[PDB]
Structure 1
């Protein structure tokens, strides 16, 4: 009976079986990672069927299967939404996870706890599937917190390293800052709309007020690492390369953008929140690209690229184009995941070297990673007919052909320029010059796992944009007419960025040296934001937490008021009363005094 529901629940269910078998004997053998990888691949090829059913018919469904607790009028149930977004995002995420695990079987070959690593990866995948398929706000919050906790665990994978623990706590802190707005949104929706269910919320909110949308925007900014709460995403590179390639690049970090996409019927009916989202996305993409164009760590550069892409996604959201932002999510997953595969291959081949100053000629020394990175950089930049072109070109056209802010449009164009800039920076400083690695050459790629995992995402980043764009139904009005110069704005900006950054990098061979300027220092230290904001508030908090809350009030004044005052008063009274020298003279004089006082007072 209508196999859509059975298949779309079976994928998620079979995604959980290795977690059940994690206590079995297979978990103690060396075949566990292959078991998990095969399970993920079968889940992907099984979830491909509901995608085909949607493409044929446009069939949509809600599955509210298990009834959880019901409080008064409100009903809470295990409900799954399998809308276009869910049935479209699930296959892409499963394919990316399959490639990531295939790569990780080789990248984590010498890691003693590799079964636990694979288990951690599968748990994150399950939680993200829960987040994507959620129909009510409570299940979505469950996935929201689960992905954050798995990210905390995976970032601090090497728990003997202080900086990994610091980065994990940073991620938790920023995610809780977003969680504040998430909880505000949940509370407002329950109080005013009387439900956490998606269907009820859309129905009873024809003109959504500011507060729930501001809460949703705060949560999205927290989880997507916008300018206010950006540094945790670059700081999350402390984890293993597969963790950075799966979670912090293509699947987890689009959680905020996906959440804002989920509530697009209420986003389109408000004009202020749209403006805030647009401005936040523009400033985030600009600042992150500006920081990226000057970094030396390849992982940092690519993470800043991811953050800039998230900013571009929220720019797309702010101009009331949620479906196009979803398409951007799907394409960016492919090509940015493959970009991290290439980066991790380079890092592993250079004996855990991440600085680009110690990598020179790799165009010929290692060709397959070379062509994969070239194709990924071309797709990111937006080459016509490439995967990037289908989404990013429409992004540029829609931002240009809309009643938006002039400053936001300018910042988006500059962000595109800087994207081209750091792309050519990566290529030039990792691939073209003379070798700069230590003399003992350990460069090797002849491994089936790495090659197959990279080439699958290569086929994806070549053909997925074309096939998906021509297979999905049309969902928005096109900009079918456009000035010729304004149609070519994206290409001319990209080529200008290429040529200018190439010229600026080509002057490094010159035998002339000068000290850096203030702009370079500002861009290299991340706008000085991670310095001040990670030293001024925390100290000012922690000191207070010891000086005022702990010692001044709790240890001293609260103690002075009730217990110490009582002790002192009772001690003084006892000393005064009991200090009698035993002279009956004084006793009987007091007796006479009280006798006469009683004779004078009580009658």
Structure 2
């Protein structure tokens, strides 16, 4: 037998194993975090093996091991699609999760429920693996909702925090609108294709229609926090830093992009949905970068950077370049996870301080996190030969060289410049200058766990792009011929954003105070979208829930029509019948009238 299926299913099963040990003395002791981390590392190597198998001969398989149920002519079975996407995403996700779990062993030392935290992280990893390897729509939806509910559980990790509860419920709401779209797509696919699996969907849908493709697009936008459904991702920073580093930025928010990638044949068949995806990605990346360039919370800045990168990936899908989107998924996972880990290290060193206005002097205060963050920012902005170069540069070239929307192309370029701008802002306000933190210096980054996790995610941020780019087979025709200025477009806009942001940030040293502008207020306050869209619609819906449905209809009029009017009529008639004075003269005269009526009327 080919070791492919055995090794892949073994990686999944050994990921599941430590959950079965969650009712044991090992779960009761303090060895559970290290136990889970070791299991994740072993799974990572055991999943690297099938990646080596694929890199040689390009082997791909489907494993429908267990048959769940047959609904007349529709068979649902537990099937895993071990293809290029799965065998490339699994090792990357496992590597990132391993690094995050070690960083969490360092970072969450004082948490009373660190064992439960590690169990939740492992459960999220299991659900994400189910989502990635799912071969049919029902199993994909299982993974979808699993990662959604794990996000809900981990965002509101501190149950006593009202803001945490609000953020968790907000994420659930937006992902549930996405699930509305997903269920629309699933229902259409079943009705018009008699199956819920990719093989038959691809066979029967030779020209996929707008209704299923728009359903998929809505689900992807909801899960990946595109414009319209974006605010939940930045608000998801209420959870602990390991949750933000692993779940949201790196692995979970790419679920919608991955879903769109998995239906790239249908996306190729359609054109209107491709245009809508391109425009949505462009507006998302521009808006989120513009909001990012003026935030004062480092976690917020990194979250908006993640949203902008998701918008760029959606742009990549919209120009019919699905494989570049997956490559960017991997590279972004690497360097964004490292950036979030560096931000968490800074926060922990400065005693839970998440304000760049209070950070400063960390370039020499903390050498290793400083160099790691600089490397991550250079990779994010597209340093000419780092991990982000082998995806972002190709994405920009494809955008320039394709039959794209002019406004979408312009917004993509401006978003790249603003990416450079907010990376400059992070570095400038976090490491350069004089200290602004409280005088009691508790800075200490000499922990081997933190150092080793950042080291593991740091070698990937430099070399992984080259290796992955040179090992994958050519999935698309390259853009060999192009003008020199159009080749340099990404670098030129990156340098321009760097210089402009650096000049504007250096202007802050002047002893000159000026009131904020309308554009600054719009950008800092997230475009006013959370304010209006979180106060007006919710107020109207909740007011209608009680004023109209509960009070006016349920408690007033539905009571007035059937039960109250009938009872009132019965009471009135009963009073009328029983209101007799007991006078024989009266009711004997009534008898006479009755006798005459019977004699005359009835014949």
Per-residue CA deviations over 1:452-505 (Å, capped at 9, x if unaligned) read 000000000010000000001001010001101110011010001001110010
CA distance in 1, matches of 2:602, 2:362: 110
Question: Displacement of 1:25 after TM fit?
Answer: 0.9
Residue by residue, what CA displacement relative to the aligned partner does 1:167-218 show, whole Å, maximum 9, x if unpaired?
Answer: 0000000000000000000000000000001100000000111000000000
CA RMSD of aligned residues (A): 0.4
- Equivalent residue number for residue 333 of structure 1: 333
1:20 matched to 2:6: no
Residue in structure 1 matched with residue 601 of structure 2 by the alignment: 601
Specify the SS of the correspondent of 2:362.
Answer: coil
Q: Write out per-residue CA displacement over residues 88-112 of structure 1, whole angstroms, 9 at most, x where no aligned residue.
A: 0000000000000000001000000
Shift in Å, 1:423: 0.3
After superposition, the C-alpha distances for 1:233-290 in whole angstroms (9 at most, x for unaligned) are 0000000000000011010000000000000000001010000000000000000000
Cα deviation 1:573-592 (Å, max 9, x = unaligned): 00001111010001110000
Q: Deviations over 1:380-402 (max 9, x none)?
A: 00011100000000000000000
Q: Alpha-carbon deviations, 1:342-397, whole Å to 9, x = none?
A: 00000000000001110111111110000000000000000111000000000000
C-alpha distance in 2 between matches for 1:17 and 1:339: 30
Please give the secondary structure, in 1, of the residue aligned with 2:65.
Answer: strand
Give 1:78 shift.
Answer: 0.4
Task: Name the counterpart of 2:152.
Answer: 152
Match of 1:538 in 2: 538
Aligned partner of residue 582 in structure 1, secondary structure: coil
CA distance in 2, matches of 1:222, 1:599: 80
**C-alpha separation in 2, matches of 1:289 and 1:559:** 54
Give 3-state SS (helix, strand or coil) of 1:266's partner. helix
Q: State how far apart, in whole Å, the 1-side matches of 2:340 and 2:581 are.
A: 91
Report how far residue 314 of structure 1 moved. 0.3
Question: CA offsets per residue over residues 386-442 of structure 1, 9 Å max, x none?
Answer: 000000000000000000100000000000000000000000000111000000000
Q: State the SS of the aligned residue for 2:254.
A: helix
2:136 matches 1:127: no
Matching residue of 2:82: 82
Query: 2-side partners of 1:500 and 1:124: how far apart?
Result: 40
Report how far residue 548 of structure 1 moved.
0.3
How high is the TM-score relative to the length of structure 2?
1.00
Q: In the alignment, which residue of structure 1 is the partner of 2:521?
A: 521
Counterpart check, 1:98 vs 2:107? no
State the 1:543 CA deviation: 0.7
Partner Cα distance (2:50, 2:11) in 1: 10
Give 3-state SS (helix, strand or coil) of 2:437's partner. coil
Alpha-carbon distance between aligned partners in 1 of 2:401 and 2:358, rounded to the nearest angstrom: 44
Paired residue secondary structure (1:68): strand
Distance in 1 between the 2:385 and 2:473 partners?
A: 19
- Matched residues in 2 for 1:414 and 1:400: separation? 13
Q: Distance in 2 between matches of 1:73 and 1:381?
A: 51
Aligned partners of 1:293 and 1:212: how far apart in 2?
Answer: 36
Report deviation, 1:70: 0.4
What residue is the counterpart of 1:399 in the other structure? Answer: 399
Question: Could you tell me how far apart the structure 1 residues matched to 2:548 and 2:359 are?
Answer: 52
Give the SS at the match of 1:34.
helix
Q: What's the offset of the Cα at 1:163?
A: 0.4
Tell me the distance in 2 between the aligned counterparts of 1:38 and 1:506: 46
1:553 shift after superposition: 0.5
Residue aligned with 2:164, SS? helix
The alpha carbon displacement at 1:43 in A equals 0.1
* d(CA) in 1 for partners of 2:429, 2:60: 48
Which secondary structure does the structure 1 equivalent of 2:76 belong to? strand
Tell me the distance in 2 between the aligned counterparts of 1:178 and 1:188: 16
Deviation per CA, 1:131-163: give whole Å up to 9, x if none.
000000000000000000000000000000100
Report how far residue 24 of structure 1 moved: 1.1
CA distance in 2: counterparts of 1:546 and 1:485, whole angstroms = 61
The DSSP-based 3-state class of the residue aligned with 2:160 is coil
- Alignment partners' CA distance in 2, 1:206 and 1:557: 53
Indicate the SS of the match to 1:514.
coil
2:72 corresponding residue in structure 1: 72
C-alpha separation in 1, matches of 2:423 and 2:356: 13
1:1-54 deviation line (CA, Å, top 9, x unaligned): 100000010000000110000001100001000000000000000100100000
- 1:428 corresponds in structure 2 to 428
TM-score if structure 1 supplies the norm length?
1.00
| Counterparts of 2:294 and 2:137, CA distance in 1 | 40
Q: For the residues of structure 2 that align with 1:165 and 1:571, how far apart are their CA atoms?
A: 51
- Report the 3-state secondary structure (helix = DSSP H, G, I; strand = E; otherwise coil) of the residue aligned with 1:228: coil
Measured in 1, the distance between the counterparts of 2:277 and 2:520 equals 29
In the TM superposition, residue 120 of structure 1 has moved relative to its aligned partner by: 0.2
Q: Deviations over 1:212-237 (max 9, x none)?
A: 00000000000000011000000000
> What do residues 534-563 of structure 1 show as CA deviations (whole Å, max 9, x unaligned)?
000000000110000000010010000001
Distance 1:197 1:505 in 2: 53
Rounded Cα–Cα distance in structure 1 between residues aligned with 2:74 and 2:158: 44
Q: 2: CA distance between counterparts of 1:419 and 1:14?
A: 39
Cα distance in 1 for partners of 2:69, 2:24 equals: 33
The residue matched to 2:475 in structure 1 has which SS? coil
The separation in 2 between residues aligned to 1:142 and 1:248, in whole angstroms, is 18
Partner of 2:569: 569
Q: 1:589 and 1:447 mapped to 2: Cα distance?
A: 108
Q: Secondary structure at the match of 1:112?
A: coil
Gaps of 5+ in 2: none
SS of the residue corresponding to residue 432 of structure 1 reads coil
Distance 1:208 1:456 in 2: 43
Alpha-carbon deviation of 1:602?
1.0
Provide structure 1 residue ranges, at least 5 long, that are not aligned to the other structure: none
Which ranges of 4 or more aligned residues in structure 1 deviate by more than 6 Å? none
